[PDB]
Nucleic acid binder design. Sequence first.
DNA 1: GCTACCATCG
DNA 2: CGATGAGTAGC
Length: 256
Amino acid sequence: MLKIISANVNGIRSAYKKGFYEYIAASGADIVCVQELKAQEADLSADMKNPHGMHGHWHCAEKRGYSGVAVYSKRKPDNVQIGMGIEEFDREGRFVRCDFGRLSVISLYLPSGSSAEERQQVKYRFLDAFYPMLEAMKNEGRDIVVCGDWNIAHQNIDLKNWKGNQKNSGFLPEEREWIGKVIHKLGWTDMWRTLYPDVPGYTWWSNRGQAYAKDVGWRIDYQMVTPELAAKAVSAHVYKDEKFSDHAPLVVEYDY
DNA sequence: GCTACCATCG
DNA sequence: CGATGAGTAGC
């Protein structure tokens, strides 16, 4: 079985302090995509780059303690791509791609827009620039999984408070419609939603109020999968036995 | 301190 | 509903 895990660690050093390093191994995952390193290459221990002897490739932000993504894998990728190809976004380390034969896995951290209008601007530009990348990827004819924090919930079932967030970044009409475009127009599969029609599967909870304990959550972490591979997915779960981050790791198993 | 990332209340 | 009011990681 091919087990792929996507986890926004909200700072990899912190997450390692909260037992994520042991989780990497215990999970028995073949590939682990992570977002929000909140660290630069110089700030990472070897175990944060090649955990348990896994291969690892990362893209770090230019500003310190900020963003960054990585892909860890037991198997050696025969090819690796660092960044999307657009300076504006690559400055923040939000895209890594690893190839393994006909399979490719991407670790993606899509910009949040809840901080300032400018950031929502950046996010929209990101959507514009990324859509065609997804189109081309879809057009390669290979098995591609885009793991990561898309920072966008699709439908009402994807977050507890859906009515009151229709005006907040993450659930704006244009965002939802963009995700819908990625799915129904481009043909990508939202693996969780397809595997489990009625299961909300929240993957994030705000630090405000008692959101976590109350399970007032959002499903903004995805594995977006190409058709042939999507058809092979057998199960998935959101790991909550331990809390490494404000996000929970999303685990999918594929009968490859 | 600073920066960057919507649940709850009236 | 609009108005109000935050906890966290890393600097």
